[PDB]
Ligand binder design. Structure first.
Ligand SMILES: C[C@@H]1[C@H]2[C@H](O[C@@H]3O[C@H](CO)[C@@H](O)[C@H](O)[C@H]3O)OC=C(C(=O)O)[C@H]2C[C@@H]1O
Ligand SMILES: Nc1ncnc2c1ncn2[C@@H]1O[C@H](CSCC[C@H](N)C(=O)O)[C@@H](O)[C@H]1O
Ligand SMILES: Nc1ncnc2c1ncn2[C@@H]1O[C@H](CSCC[C@H](N)C(=O)O)[C@@H](O)[C@H]1O
Lengths: 358, 356
């Protein structure tokens, strides 16, 4: 399965309380949800959405909260509002999906007590089927689909054209490595869409928010995620040159992520042919005109990468890794604060096609 | 509201998952009941309510952490699947695992069988409340959970009442005021459970219940294994009082929120609720009936069940001294458990949700 969930407690080092960026994405996304419900959720006279049956909502890659709760409440409230305009009130059933090793204990223990929906947790890779056919009316996936199901094996192979020596991700400049990652993304995202097309009802909506490439931009390294990753690699190599880890440990380490362009996403979706694209765009993120926060960014990265870094390098690498990291962020403060593209959060609104619609 | 006392989490040698073999035997014995219930009472053929275009939805109420809940759910899926095949249908299955919010769903999820043929979801919440949309469950299951009350009866906590449960932590059956208080709480809780389930289960849907109870013809709960295990847990606590390790008031004020009903107790609540018919009822033949009493495993079984509620009231420093004494007392009562106790205390029900 090759699963890497986020740091799962409720304390200072947990995802719950180092996921403020991904929350701003949700906050700006509320408008996206509301507009998609009002313009594209066809409730009226439509037995697919018969309010005598429950309205079922699923979050794919929900993590441990609070972001997933804000997102789900946004959807429940927008949908409940439209039904109200039709003098109906269905029950809501909300499903929280993540990897089997996600901390569902923490999630369940922090469910809003005030909630007006029934809740369930659904353990399993969203690159597989996790629901019966035709059961989901509204699907949501925010900041999860850039995670691949695995590192492309050819970049781990010393003898491959695509061997990713001396780096932990891609920048856009090495043709063979980028091709390997993009190839893996095509397969994973197609598997996601295939599973969702079976699970989502005809006319059902799916909203996706994903770290991507800003339009026109060809170099992932000129995004914020891209430079952060590049510096993580250079920070690891400094631990190498000090002798604290060997060079093989870094050569063999790679991030299982791809950050697609809008054109990349559109290609896979159109080929899959089960969803219509109702809208694509970018999310203006709320913290955009604040100054770059060197310290807090270094913490957000650690809370994301801790497990995968530990599992490969061991616990004892973290504290000295990220003190080097923070240092490299500071030397690059200008770039992060005034040069890098702020607009790399992409969103898509999809609608599941009818069975007689090609 | 909710006073939740889940079983010991994790998957190590002290966990519920490694110390719940007796509860597994109950499910193993009930497999025959499920098969017969499906074959004779689940009206699949040409019934729009069980339209295999939709999934067949199964819920386990009080599932804990595995593996017992997986065995029960596999048994239900296999029997229902078999019957559908005889009608040349092949529905998908959606299996819901319900327990308290503080249950260890992490352990449960991480130990789900890889080769299952059902979609799975965990549902956190007290089963004395609604936890599913109305009219959505086709088959409900509940094994060794419904003897857990929503709370201790207030009467037995009241120093002014003859029901005040001084120097004891449960009932043996000789104290009529205490027994009446627990039975009262049980009618209220079990009624609330049936009410919520009637809203959730489809017309003709089944509910299968296994519960520790009062054996046929028996009046004294202390004549069951559970009853004697509780009696001796009380006396072990009073030994800690005597040794100055806990004060007497802490035992006086502590009580187990449990009631172990007779069949007649169960029938009375079900008849008054009036939403289910009793299709089958009886006592299970437990597969461990003829094995020798195991002192160490039984002590560990009880700790796995009780550690949370004991810790909340007495503090964790009490646990090891308490179960050192408990183990000694189980050993002193070896022959009673081995040969004298009634072992026919596993009751079952097959209920079917009524029309109108
Ligand atoms: C000590 C009892 C335990 C019970 O013990 C069993 O109770 C049955 C019924 O009396 C006996 O036959 C058997 O010997 C004994 O192991 O096993 C399962 C319980 C639970 O799941 O909460 C608890 C309930 C009660 O706390
Ligand atoms: N294949 C997969 N199946 C299920 N969850 C996955 C997954 N790949 C990544 N994830 C999950 O996606 C989450 C990304 S963190 C994002 C969490 C949340 N949606 C938010 O907006 O803040 C993690 O919890 C991770 O475990
Ligand atoms: N009100 C309630 N709501 C949900 N679960 C409850 C409950 N009261 C007790 N339980 C759960 O019921 C379980 C009883 S132990 C039985 C576990 C499992 N059915 C088996 O056969 O082994 C515990 O996990 C306990 O937490």
């Amino acid at each position: 399965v090759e699963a890497h969930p986020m740091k799962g407690g409720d304390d200072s080092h947990s995802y719950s309380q180092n996921s403020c960026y991904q929350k701003g994405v949700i906050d700006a996304a509320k408008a996206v949800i509301v507009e998609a419900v009002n313009e594209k959720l066809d409730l009226e006279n439509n037995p697919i959405f018969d309010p005598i049956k429950p309205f079922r909502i699923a979050d794919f890659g929900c993590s441990t909260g609070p972001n997933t709760f804000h997102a789900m409440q946004n959807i429940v409230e927008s949908v409940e509002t439209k039904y109200k305009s039709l003098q109906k009130t269905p029950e809501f059933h909300v499903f929280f999906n993540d990897h089997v090793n996600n901390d569902f204990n923490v999630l369940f223990r922090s469910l809003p007590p005030n909630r007006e929906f029934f809740a369930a947790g659904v353990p399993g890779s969203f690159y597989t089927r996790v629901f019966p056919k035709n059961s989901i009316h509204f699907a949501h996936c925010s900041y999860a689909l850039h995670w691949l199901s695995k590192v492309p094996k050819e970049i781990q192979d010393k003898n491959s054209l695509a061997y990713n020596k001396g780096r932990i991700h891609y920048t856009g400049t090495e043709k063979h490595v980028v091709k390997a990652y993009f190839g893996q993304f095509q397969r994973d995202f197609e598997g996601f869409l295939k599973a969702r097309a079976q699970e989502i009802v005809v006319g059902g909506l799916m909203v996706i928010q994903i770290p991507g490439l800003p339009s026109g931009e060809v170099l992932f390294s000129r995004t914020g995620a891209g430079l952060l990753h590049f510096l993580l690699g250079t920070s690891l190599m400094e631990l190498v040159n000090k002798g604290i880890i060997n060079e093989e440990s870094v050569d063999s380490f790679n991030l299982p992520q791809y950050h697609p362009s809008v054109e990349d996403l559109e290609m896979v979706i159109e080929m899959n042919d089960c969803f219509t694209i109702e809208r694509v765009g970018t999310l203006p993120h709320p913290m955009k005109n604040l100054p770059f926060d060197v310290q807090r960014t270094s913490l957000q990265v650690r809370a994301i990468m801790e497990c995968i870094l530990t599992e490969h390098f061991g616990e004892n690498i973290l504290d000295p890794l990220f003190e080097i990291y923070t240092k490299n962020l500071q030397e690059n403060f200008h770039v992060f604060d005034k040069e890098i593209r702020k607009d790399a959060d992409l969103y898509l609104v999809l609608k599941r096609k009818g069975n007689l619609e090609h």
